[PDB]
């Protein structure tokens, strides 16, 4: 006369990263190494109209 353990079940997590989501259509990635080429986190632009 016994008792049974009918199953063991675990969810598995998968991911689909940032460059795969379509929210990235809006922004452009960069190195972050050449953030050290600019000084003080600034970038100048001479825009002519």
């Amino acid at each position: 006369k016994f008792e049974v353990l009918l199953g063991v079940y675990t969810n598995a997590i998968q991911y689909v990263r940032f460059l795969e989501t379509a929210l990235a259509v809006s922004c452009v990635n960069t190195e972050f190494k050449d953030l050290s080429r600019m000084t003080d986190g600034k970038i100048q632009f001479r825009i002519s109209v």
């Binding site: 452009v28 960069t30 190195e31 190494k33 050449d34 080429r37």
Partner: peptide, 22 residues
């Protein structure tokens, strides 16, 4: 001469040199 500095940001600013450049 103005190249050799960046990894990619110089490629981002554009290459045409009639519209944008360093």
């Amino acid at each position: 001469a103005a190249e050799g500095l960046f990894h990619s940001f110089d490629l981002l600013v554009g290459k045409d040199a009639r519209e944008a450049g360093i």
